[PDB]
């Protein structure tokens, strides 16, 4: 069962690296005039640690089917913070080459949507 290996591993470091890459475009601008006002919130993120993210993904290397399941799990975890439907595009593009970022091989078939 591929699901058994997913529970043992933790994909949180992979999510941080992908979202921090977006970084919300360090420069200013793109302010919506009618955007929500927002307010102070009750609570710096962890370091890059892309090596740690690959180590978690190293388990799902031989099984390409298991690799895609791990990639889709990353999409589900961060499917709420992504807004605008073009930032989600940016998340999907980086997730596809995330196995390519490591020494692993990207799955041939995978549907992130």
């Amino acid at each position, epitope marked *: 069962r591929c699901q058994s290996q997913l529970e043992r591993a933790n994909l949180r470091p992979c999510e941080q690296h992908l979202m921090q890459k977006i970084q919300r475009d360090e420069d200013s601008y793109e302010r919506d*005039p*009618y955007s*929500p006002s927002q307010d102070p919130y009750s609570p710096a993120g962890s370091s890059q640690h892309q090596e740690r993210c690959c180590n978690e993904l190293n388990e799902f290397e031989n099984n390409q089917r298991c690799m895609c399941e791990a990639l889709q799990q990353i999409m589900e975890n961060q499917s709420d913070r992504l807004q605008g*439907r073009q930032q989600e595009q940016q998340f999907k593009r980086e997730l596809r080459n995330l196995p390519q970022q490591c020494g692993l091989r990207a799955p041939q078939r995978c549907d992130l949507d």
Partner: antibody
Amino acid sequence: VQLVESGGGVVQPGRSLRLSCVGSGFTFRRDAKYWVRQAPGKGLEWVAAISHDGGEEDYAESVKGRFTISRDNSRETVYLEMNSLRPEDTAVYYCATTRSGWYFDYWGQGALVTVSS
Amino acid sequence: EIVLTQSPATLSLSPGARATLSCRASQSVDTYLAWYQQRRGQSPRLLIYDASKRATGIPARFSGSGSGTDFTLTISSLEPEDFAVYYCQQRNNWRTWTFGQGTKVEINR
């Protein structure tokens, strides 16, 4: 969660009428406010829009500067000061809120404004 | 500017039958489009936002699809309260909001 509108009536052309829309059950200041009217036997048309804080105000070309939109977050009320009223302005006016600033999520019961001499 | 076109303007369908609505934009508006429902003498309500997601409390029989210019709204089964007028809305350059001319759904007899 619901919007209540008041101030409708019959106004002679060239006069001025001010509409009010009180919000309750939600944070009024957290979202922007809009005004959408509907002529009898006609589709909806956006008229005025005010930001979540009143910083930016935008209006359709049908009204231009004749209409003024304002809000009082303390009263949870958004106003629509209509000036130089024309016969084409005769419509039922709605007030709407929107969390994301894009789509009119909630609507009021509507206020009927009639411009006739 | 970007204008919206709703077609057909009137649909005559039997109760409990599938309904399909179409809204077309003059140029691409990405996925930013919303659908609304307005019954006889009733305030408009939001049905579909982002042309894909379903608004809270909306029955599952209402589904939205489409991207770019062409957009489709589909009702799996026409309930008695579903016979109303539907509008499509989209926002221009963070300044103006536009609506379609409206589509009327009526019972077939």
